[PDB]
């Protein structure tokens, strides 16, 4: 059993797995990396008691099945010490692994592989595949509304909802809702799950928007995604995410269309003089008119007027300018449609070109 490795190909999975790993795992073996070999491939796996990230790479040279554990810090130091572009020779000899660096031999502590918290068997409840572009678009549309730290634990993640041919992502923090749904091409059972903050953040920072589609399988408790040679699995929460249909306005009569660029520029210009902490603005909407006003604790008034299309009455709506700016930034379209009922009701934002995504903002009451 000889392990021959190339430094250039070795680099990348090691960095990806060591990313989540910290300086102090708080356990003797949690920071250790599980290296296993089966058939003609080897998998390098890392866990932090709440996720598992495994990179699988094939080989050409013969070998035998096995599994072992290697410290991450010492392994990284050994890799760094070796000259770039060299070959790494590892041997499983007794209780201590033997690494041959040229004419030098070094002994590294080894621990049993049966003690590594890794899944031996996996069961999937709903499985499918999608291009990375679909997931990237959905997350970019929905994640910015995700809550960071709220007592309502169910509201600090993202709801993945698969219904028939449609896949949807929903997020909210009690003040703003972002929903993004579109077809995937294959029918699926009506299943809804919640992915936490860390899962979505890791998926985003790991996703590269490549042409190779990734497969996602969601079991009873966990969600696993395999893209290319990487597989990342996290554990869900199932906090019974609130139904997104109700929070949406019920038949909003007052609809107004505006230019996305003009509206975003107007809101950005208003935000400078708005309350730097509350960040509240007022919108006087009237016939083909939108007057944006902002005040400061120092009584600094900022007013601007925008020409839009609107056939409703005159009303005044309070908003958080930061949330509106985030929605506009995540929108990235030429036209924006705002639907509302009254000053004391949530206001919905969509695009006329495509309704695949929608957002809802809760107004300000003083």
């Amino acid at each position: 059993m000889k392990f021959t490795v190339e430094r250039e190909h070795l680099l990348k999975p090691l960095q990806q797995v060591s990313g989540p790993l910290g300086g102090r795992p708080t356990l003797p073996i949690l920071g250790n990396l599980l290296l296993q070999v089966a058939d003609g491939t080897l998998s390098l796996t890392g866990t932090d008691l709440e996720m598992e990230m495994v990179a699988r790479v094939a080989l050409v040279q013969p070998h035998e099945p096995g599994a072992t554990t290697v410290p991450a810090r010492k392994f990284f130091d050994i890799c760094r010490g070796l000259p770039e572009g060299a070959e790494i020779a590892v041997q499983l000899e007794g209780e201590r692994m033997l690494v041959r660096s040229g004419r030098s031999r070094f002994s590294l502590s080894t621990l049993p592989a049966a003690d590594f918290p890794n899944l031996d068997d996996w069961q999937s409840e709903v499985e499918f595949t999608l291009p990375q572009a679909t997931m990237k678009r959905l997350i970019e549309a929905t994640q910015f509304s995700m809550a960071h730290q709220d007592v309502r634990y169910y509201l600090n993640g993202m709801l993945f909802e698969t219904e028939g041919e449609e896949l949807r992502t929903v997020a909210t923090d009690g003040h703003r809702l972002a929903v993004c749904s579109m077809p995937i091409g294959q029918s699926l059972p009506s299943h809804s799950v919640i992915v936490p903050r860390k899962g979505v953040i890791e998926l985003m920072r790991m996703l590269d928007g490549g042409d190779n589609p990734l497969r996602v399988q969601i079991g009873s408790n966990n969600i696993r995604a395999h893209v290319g040679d990487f597989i990342f699995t996290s554990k869900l929460v199932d906090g019974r995410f609130p139904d997104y249909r109700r929070v949406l306005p019920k038949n909003p009569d007052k609809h107004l269309e505006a230019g996305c660029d003009l509206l975003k520029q107007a809101f950005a210009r208003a935000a400078i003089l708005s309350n730097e902490k509350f960040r509240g603005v007022r919108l006087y909407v009237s016939e083909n008119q939108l007057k944006i006003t902002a005040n400061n604790p120092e009584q600094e008034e900022a007013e601007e007027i925008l020409d839009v299309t609107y056939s409703g009455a005159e009303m005044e709506i309070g908003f958080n300018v930061s949330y509106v700016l985030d929605v506009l930034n995540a929108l990235k379209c030429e036209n924006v449609r705002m639907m509302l009922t009254d000053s004391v009701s949530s206001v919905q934002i969509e695009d006329a070109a495509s309704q695949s995504a929608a957002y809802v903002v809760m107004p300000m009451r003083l």
Partner: protein
């Protein structure tokens, strides 16, 4: 930790509840020190986390059992005070609750072990109350405390209380005799001293506590005739002052019972010291000194950072003052 024989029945009972799926999510074990409640909690957690249990005992070879042996199970979030401290903060409870807030990685059950709820801070206990009221599905808690009365009323209300009674006195005596080679009188004295909880008596024998008790008894024997109780401080000033105060209180109680007439005494190993203490002091003086000793022991235990030697010498001076004739002796009163 060790699994003592007397844990066999109670465990076999508790697991039976979990065998039927009706086990209580919050379990509070009321066990004295040395009763091996930690072993019981560990066995219950092992059974709960076993993937393919057989009968009552766990299989020992499934993934859950392997992780338990390795002590790295993603579930099983234990709560305990820091090694350098003696109390558990609210931050630890917060992070453990956050971890429990989501599904188990293995898809089985999540276990939470509070090593000692007595050390739990008021804020920490109040934070734990919410998760204890309505734990998520397949979430189990295993608290432990010597005196459940010391815990908050709410926290005790949430939990299902299981009292781990000690074995029969003769059984504990013979178990200790088989374990430690010492005179049966000393074993019985230690068992009565430890509230009849074997293991705690075994721990006392294992350490130097027995020699400390012998030195304290000799010092008290010298002091009682001469009345120079101050010298007792030499045998009392130590990091284990509460235990020595408990020993002195038991000696005084034995002397008082001998005065009132009794057939059994906790400190059976020293009949002479008990007889001399009972003869040289009147029952009122014995009662006053015993009450003072217990009060000072309680003050030392409850209060943090109190000057040990100052309190001990104040107690000694007050005891000497009581022995003086014509001095009013205080009586306990709420």
């Amino acid at each position: 930790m060790r699994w003592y024989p007397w844990l066999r029945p109670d465990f076999e009972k508790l697991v039976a509840s979990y065998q039927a799926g009706r086990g209580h999510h919050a379990l509070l074990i009321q066990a004295l020190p040395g009763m091996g409640d930690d072993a019981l909690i560990y066995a219950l957690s092992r059974y709960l986390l076993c993937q393919q249990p057989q009968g009552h005992k766990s299989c020992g070879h499934c993934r859950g059992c392997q992780l338990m042996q390795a002590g790295t199970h993603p579930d099983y979030y234990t709560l305990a005070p820091e090694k350098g401290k003696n109390t558990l903060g609210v931050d630890a409870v917060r992070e453990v609750t956050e971890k429990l807030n989501e599904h188990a990685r293995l898809g089985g059950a999540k276990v939470v072990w509070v090593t000692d709820a007595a050390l739990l801070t008021d804020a920490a206990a109040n934070a734990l109350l919410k998760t204890l009221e309505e734990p998520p599905a397949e979430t189990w808690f295993f608290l432990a405390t010597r005196e459940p009365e010391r815990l908050l009323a709410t926290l005790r209300s949430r939990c299902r209380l299981h009292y781990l009674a000690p074995p029969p006195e003769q059984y504990a005596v013979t178990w200790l005799s088989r374990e430690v080679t010492m005179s049966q009188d000393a074993l019985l004295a230690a068992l009565r001293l430890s509230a009849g909880s074997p293991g705690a008596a075994l721990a006392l024998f294992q350490g130097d506590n027995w020699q400390a008790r012998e030195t304290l008894c000799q010092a008290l024997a010298y002091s009682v005739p001469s009345g120079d109780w101050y010298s007792l401080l030499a045998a009392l000033n130590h990091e284990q002052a509460p235990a020595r105060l408990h020993w002195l209180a038991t000696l005084l109680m034995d002397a008082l019972k001998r005065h009132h007439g009794a057939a059994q005494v906790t400190n059976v190993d020293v009949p002479g010291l008990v007889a001399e203490l009972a003869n040289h002091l009147s029952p009122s003086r014995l009662q006053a000194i015993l009450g003072d000793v217990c009060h000072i022991r309680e003050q030392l235990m409850s209060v943090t950072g109190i000057n040990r030697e100052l309190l001990i010498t104040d107690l000694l001076l007050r005891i000497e003052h009581y022995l003086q004739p014509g001095v009013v002796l205080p009586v306990p009163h709420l």
